[PDB]
Amino acid sequence: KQPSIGRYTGKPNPSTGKYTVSFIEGDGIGPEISKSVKKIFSAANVPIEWESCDVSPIFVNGLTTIPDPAVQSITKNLVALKGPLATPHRSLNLTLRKTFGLFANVRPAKSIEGFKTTYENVDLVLIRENTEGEYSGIEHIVCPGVVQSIKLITRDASERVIRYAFEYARAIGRPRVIVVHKSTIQRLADGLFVNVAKELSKEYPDLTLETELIDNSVLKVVTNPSAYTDAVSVCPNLYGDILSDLNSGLSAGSLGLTPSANIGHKISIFEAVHGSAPDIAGQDKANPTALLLSSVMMLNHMGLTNHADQIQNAVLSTIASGPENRTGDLAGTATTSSFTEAVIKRL
Amino acid sequence: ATAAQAERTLPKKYGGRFTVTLIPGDGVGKEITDSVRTIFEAENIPIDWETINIKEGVYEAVESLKRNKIGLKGLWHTPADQTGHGSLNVALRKQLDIYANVALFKSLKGVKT
């Protein structure tokens, strides 16, 4: 089973056995990291054909818009898998969420086999509100030296993130679900978030709801990452943006291994959260693992369990064991090229 | 908060026009001040006189100067008798803590000294 909230509407393209998925290779190490995924996907016989599209922004009305070619493509196939892209008046990633109704960031950070970092047994899952909160565009100059940034928290927006969290926690068999907040000094704002979880709590009796102040969420996670290996934490935009980049710091010390999923109501985009790495581009040193794992997250979201587990449980996760494999970023000596074939072997 | 709009401490000024306090005072005061008025409007200088006249309304001089911050005055007269009122030239200064007097003694070209 999978989460009711951002449900994929399947339908393989009747003419081919396959499902249609928009790519968005992106720029930089994007292209190489991308076809790396296309090959590994081919080999495992994934019911998927790629409809690559370009999100290079237009500027209808001074406000940055995203091209019709790519809109039609992505709204059609209810799913897309983007790599990293560069930096262009409105955040490219923002107008990407606004035009596709994406509202929830899902960020897992798990230790990698055969890559030693300072923190161990870190297996973390966090859902983040990506609509409102601290990150609504609302700020004012109330007078000369005085500014107001306005944090917006609504029940509607909160409800549907907290739901996906309960339902996602259920879909991956974690008992506990923690609402990170600060009702302490943000009584109304964070209080509403918390209450909305407490009220939803009841229609998900298989899961146990806990509430934690970021105070402790950050304290406890850094002292002992494993205390949340039955986690799924939900939180408003800011706490989420920080905790997730933190969790990654614990798991891998950077975020070249971190996959994200951006869930919308009927659409959903799955991306790697590292940059365009322009200086390593073309030289075949990139590390597909990041995007590759986002592929897995996508597979599961689509329903292709068997393939996802196949490409994750075996392959990559397992081929990242033996330094002859691996990439430069993990001490390894292998190329993007050799990593991909070395991966497909254990497919 | 404060800094720009604040400035309730500079000299009274409204759209380019200062409002200065004028205290003609006793003796040739009244005439000698007038001389300045005339030279001022004849030069169309952007200042408007708030002008006051007065036994203990030395209060009103103070209160005015506290609004406008700046003033132009002659001298008042001071009694030598016992039941006389007391300088009130000094009263003005003490009550505004205008503690420093500067006098400029520079000889002038067309004057036999």
UniProtKB/Swiss-Prot annotation, chain A:
Q: Where in the cell is it found?
A: Mitochondrion matrix
What sort of enzyme, by top EC class, is this? oxidoreductase
One GO CC term on file: isocitrate dehydrogenase complex (NAD+)
Residues annotated for substrate binding in this entry: 97, 107, 128, 215
Query: Per the UniProt record, which residue ranges are transmembrane?
Result: none
State which Enzyme Commission number(s) the record gives. Answer: 1.1.1.41
Q: How is its activity regulated?
A: Allosterically regulated by several compounds including AMP, NAD(+), and citrate.
GO process terms (BP): glutamate biosynthetic process; isocitrate metabolic process; tricarboxylic acid cycle
Where Phosphothreonine occurs, the residues are 87, 131, 305, 327
Q: Which reaction does it catalyse?
A: D-threo-isocitrate + NAD(+) = 2-oxoglutarate + CO2 + NADH
GO MF annotation, one: RNA binding
Per the record's keyword annotation, is Oxidoreductase included, yes or no?
yes
Q: Where is this site: Critical for catalysis?
A: 135, 182
- Quaternary structure note: Octamer of two non-identical subunits IDH1 and IDH2.
Q: What does this protein do?
A: Performs an essential role in the oxidative function of the citric acid cycle. Also binds RNA; specifically to the 5'-untranslated leaders of mitochondrial mRNAs.
Q: What is this protein called?
A: Isocitrate dehydrogenase [NAD] subunit 2, mitochondrial
* Lineage of producing organism: Eukaryota, Fungi, Dikarya, Ascomycota, Saccharomycotina
From Swiss-Prot, chain B:
Q: List the disulfide bonds.
A: none
Localization (cell): Mitochondrion
Please, which domain of life does this record's source organism belong to? Eukaryota
- Where along the chain is substrate bound? 93
Protein family (similarity comment): Belongs to the isocitrate and isopropylmalate dehydrogenases family.
* Described purpose of this protein according to its UniProt entry: Performs an essential role in the oxidative function of the citric acid cycle. Also binds RNA; specifically to the 5'-untranslated leaders of mitochondrial mRNAs.
Q: Assembly and partners?
A: Octamer of two non-identical subunits IDH1 and IDH2.
Misc. remarks from the entry: Present with 10500 molecules/cell in log phase SD medium.
Record protein name field: Isocitrate dehydrogenase [NAD] subunit 1, mitochondrial
Which source organism? Saccharomyces cerevisiae (strain ATCC 204508 / S288c) (Baker's yeast)
